[model samples]
Target: GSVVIGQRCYRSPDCYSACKKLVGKATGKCTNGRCDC
Candidate 1:
Protein backbone atom coordinates (compact mmCIF):
# COMPACT_ATOMS: atom_id res chain seq x y z
CA GLY A 1 0.00 0.00 0.00
CA SER A 2 0.98 3.66 -0.38
CA VAL A 3 0.18 7.06 1.17
CA VAL A 4 -0.13 10.71 0.25
CA ILE A 5 -1.03 14.09 1.67
CA GLY A 6 -4.10 13.86 3.92
CA GLN A 7 -4.03 10.10 3.59
CA ARG A 8 -4.13 7.60 6.42
CA CYS A 9 -1.59 4.92 7.27
CA TYR A 10 -0.41 2.55 9.97
CA ARG A 11 2.37 4.05 12.02
CA SER A 12 2.82 6.80 9.53
CA PRO A 13 6.25 8.41 9.53
CA ASP A 14 6.77 12.05 8.61
CA CYS A 15 9.70 11.10 6.39
CA TYR A 16 11.85 8.22 5.30
CA SER A 17 14.57 9.16 7.73
CA ALA A 18 12.17 9.00 10.66
CA CYS A 19 10.80 5.69 9.50
CA LYS A 20 14.32 4.32 9.23
CA LYS A 21 14.79 5.26 12.84
CA LEU A 22 11.96 2.94 13.83
CA VAL A 23 13.05 -0.40 15.31
CA GLY A 24 11.08 -3.50 14.40
CA LYS A 25 9.62 -5.31 11.42
CA ALA A 26 8.32 -1.98 10.10
CA THR A 27 9.81 -0.25 7.09
CA GLY A 28 9.47 2.98 5.10
CA LYS A 29 8.40 4.05 1.64
CA CYS A 30 7.82 7.33 -0.18
CA THR A 31 4.63 7.97 -2.07
CA ASN A 32 2.86 11.04 -3.41
CA GLY A 33 5.32 13.39 -1.83
CA ARG A 34 5.14 11.82 1.62
CA CYS A 35 6.48 8.91 3.64
CA ASP A 36 4.39 5.89 4.62
CA CYS A 37 5.33 3.32 7.24
Candidate 2:
Protein backbone atom coordinates (compact mmCIF):
# COMPACT_ATOMS: atom_id res chain seq x y z
CA GLY A 1 0.00 0.00 0.00
CA SER A 2 1.09 3.61 -0.73
CA VAL A 3 -0.06 7.14 -1.30
CA VAL A 4 0.75 9.98 -3.67
CA ILE A 5 0.20 13.72 -3.46
CA GLY A 6 0.19 16.86 -5.62
CA GLN A 7 -0.03 17.14 -9.40
CA ARG A 8 1.86 14.55 -11.44
CA CYS A 9 3.71 14.86 -14.66
CA TYR A 10 2.40 13.92 -18.08
CA ARG A 11 2.62 10.15 -18.79
CA SER A 12 2.54 9.51 -14.99
CA PRO A 13 6.06 8.12 -14.81
CA ASP A 14 6.87 10.70 -12.15
CA CYS A 15 4.13 9.45 -9.91
CA TYR A 16 5.05 5.80 -10.46
CA SER A 17 8.72 6.48 -9.85
CA ALA A 18 7.92 8.53 -6.76
CA CYS A 19 5.95 5.67 -5.27
CA LYS A 20 8.63 3.15 -6.19
CA LYS A 21 11.40 5.27 -4.75
CA LEU A 22 9.56 6.39 -1.66
CA VAL A 23 7.49 3.35 -0.78
CA GLY A 24 9.17 0.59 -2.74
CA LYS A 25 5.87 -0.03 -4.49
CA ALA A 26 4.10 1.13 -7.64
CA THR A 27 0.65 1.26 -6.12
CA GLY A 28 -0.61 4.67 -7.08
CA LYS A 29 -2.57 6.50 -9.73
CA CYS A 30 -2.67 9.85 -11.47
CA THR A 31 -6.03 11.60 -11.67
CA ASN A 32 -6.90 15.17 -12.55
CA GLY A 33 -3.22 15.69 -13.17
CA ARG A 34 -2.57 14.74 -9.58
CA CYS A 35 -1.13 11.66 -7.93
CA ASP A 36 -3.71 9.72 -5.99
CA CYS A 37 -2.47 6.74 -4.07
Candidate 3:
Protein backbone atom coordinates (compact mmCIF):
# COMPACT_ATOMS: atom_id res chain seq x y z
CA GLY A 1 0.00 0.00 0.00
CA SER A 2 1.07 3.59 -0.68
CA VAL A 3 0.00 7.16 -0.05
CA VAL A 4 0.45 10.65 -1.45
CA ILE A 5 0.95 13.97 0.27
CA GLY A 6 -1.45 14.74 3.10
CA GLN A 7 -2.12 11.06 3.33
CA ARG A 8 -1.18 8.38 5.83
CA CYS A 9 2.33 6.98 5.49
CA TYR A 10 4.44 4.80 7.73
CA ARG A 11 7.96 5.43 6.43
CA SER A 12 10.10 8.03 4.69
CA PRO A 13 10.76 5.90 1.61
CA ASP A 14 7.08 5.62 0.78
CA CYS A 15 6.29 9.26 1.50
CA TYR A 16 9.42 10.58 -0.16
CA SER A 17 8.70 8.83 -3.44
CA ALA A 18 5.06 9.85 -3.31
CA CYS A 19 6.08 13.47 -2.87
CA LYS A 20 8.69 13.34 -5.63
CA LYS A 21 6.20 11.91 -8.05
CA LEU A 22 3.32 14.15 -7.11
CA VAL A 23 5.09 17.40 -6.28
CA GLY A 24 8.27 16.86 -8.29
CA LYS A 25 10.48 17.52 -5.29
CA ALA A 26 13.99 16.09 -5.23
CA THR A 27 13.50 15.20 -1.61
CA GLY A 28 10.71 15.16 0.94
CA LYS A 29 10.05 14.14 4.50
CA CYS A 30 7.16 12.68 6.36
CA THR A 31 5.49 14.55 9.17
CA ASN A 32 2.76 13.01 11.26
CA GLY A 33 2.21 10.50 8.48
CA ARG A 34 1.88 13.22 5.88
CA CYS A 35 4.31 13.79 3.04
CA ASP A 36 5.85 17.20 3.34
CA CYS A 37 7.22 17.86 -0.09
Among the numbered candidates, top TM-score falls to: 3
Candidate 3 lDDT by residue in tens digits, 1-37:
2333565566667665456666347446666877766
lDDT of each: 0.48, 0.62, 0.59
> For candidate 3, what is the lDDT?
0.59
Task: Report the Cα lDDT for residue 11, model 2.
Answer: 57
User: Which candidate number has the best lDDT?
Assistant: 2
Tens digits of per-residue lDDT for model 1, 1-37: 3333343344445454455555542446556555665
C-alpha lDDT (0 to 100) for residue 14 of candidate 1: 44
Overall local distance difference test of candidate 1: 0.48
Give candidate 1's root-mean-square deviation (CA, Å).
7.2
Q: Which residue pairs in model 2 clash with each other?
A: none
In model 2, which runs have C-alpha deviations exceeding 4 angstroms?
1-4, 22-25
lDDT of 2 by residue, 1-36 (tens): 446576475556657756665655673677677776
Give the candidate order by descending TM-score.
Answer: 3, 2, 1
Q: Which clashing pairs does model 1 show?
A: none
Better of 2 and 3 by TM-score: 3
